[PDB]
Structure formats: C-alpha cells, structure tokens
Amino acid sequence: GRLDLPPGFMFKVQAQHDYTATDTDELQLKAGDVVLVIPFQNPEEQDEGWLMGVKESDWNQHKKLEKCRGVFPENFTERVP
C-alpha cells in the first residue's frame, strides 16, 4: 500500500459491529474491520464517542488520506495492540 505513514497517527483498531455511516466524510465500519486512530484536524469537529480514524484499506490510499479521513464511534470499536 502506501509508502509513508500518517502523521499524528495513534494505533490500529478493530471494529466489533457494523455501523453504516453515510456522510460527506463519514467512516463506514463493518463488524470486524480495521481502522487506524489518527488525530483529526480539530476536536471541535469531533463528536462525543466518535473520533477521526481511517480504515486499513484507506491507509493504502494514505497518499490521499486527506480524502480518506472519516469519523467512527470508538465505543463501537476495539483497540488493537
């Protein structure tokens, strides 16, 4: 996939449910998905219980992550050590 990693990135997470998100910049998660926790552009754009993360596949497009950026409920996902 990508050659470089996203700056500010935190870690990889694993969804535990299928949350269909349909927005202009939402993050669709599927029960058993892989998403990376990254620092959004601002916390004022983040919701309560939802953070800015990108899917594993999207990572491959890290080249244009700026267009892969999305949001997802952390309480609906799990942290991957």
Swiss-Prot record:
Tissue localization of expression: Ubiquitous. Highest expression in the brain and muscle. Expressed in oligodendrocytes. Isoform IIA is expressed only in the brain, where it is detected in the gray matter, but not in the white matter. Isoform BIN1 is widely expressed with highest expression in skeletal muscle.
Entry comment on modification after translation: Phosphorylated by protein kinase C.
Domain of life of the native organism: Eukaryota
Domain SH3: 8-81
Assembly description: Heterodimer with AMPH. Binds SH3GLB1. Interacts (via SH3 domain) with DNM1. Interacts with SYNJ1. Interacts (via SH3 domain) with DNM2. Isoform IIA interacts with CLTC. Isoform IIB does not interact with CLTC. Isoform IIC1 does not interact with CLTC. Isoform IIC2 does not interact with CLTC. Interacts with AP2A2. Interacts with AP2B1. Interacts with MYC (via N-terminal transactivation domain); the interaction requires the integrity of the conserved MYC box regions 1 and 2. Interacts with BIN2. Interacts with SNX4. Interacts (via BAR domain) with BACE1. Binds (via BAR domain) F-actin. (Microbial infection) Interacts (SH3 domain) with HCV NS5A.
Function: Is a key player in the control of plasma membrane curvature, membrane shaping and membrane remodeling. Required in muscle cells for the formation of T-tubules, tubular invaginations of the plasma membrane that function in depolarization-contraction coupling. Is a negative regulator of endocytosis. Is also involved in the regulation of intracellular vesicles sorting, modulation of BACE1 trafficking and the control of amyloid-beta production. In neuronal circuits, endocytosis regulation may influence the internalization of PHF-tau aggregates.
Disorder: Myopathy, centronuclear, 2: A congenital muscle disorder characterized by progressive muscular weakness and wasting involving mainly limb girdle, trunk, and neck muscles. It may also affect distal muscles. Weakness may be present during childhood or adolescence or may not become evident until the third decade of life. Ptosis is a frequent clinical feature. BIN1 mutations have been found in families segregating autosomal dominant centronuclear myopathy. Patients show adult-onset, mildly progressive muscle weakness affecting selected proximal muscles and all distal muscles of the lower limbs.
Stated name of the protein: Myc box-dependent-interacting protein 1
Protein source organism: Homo sapiens (Human)
Span within the parent record: 513 to 593 of 593
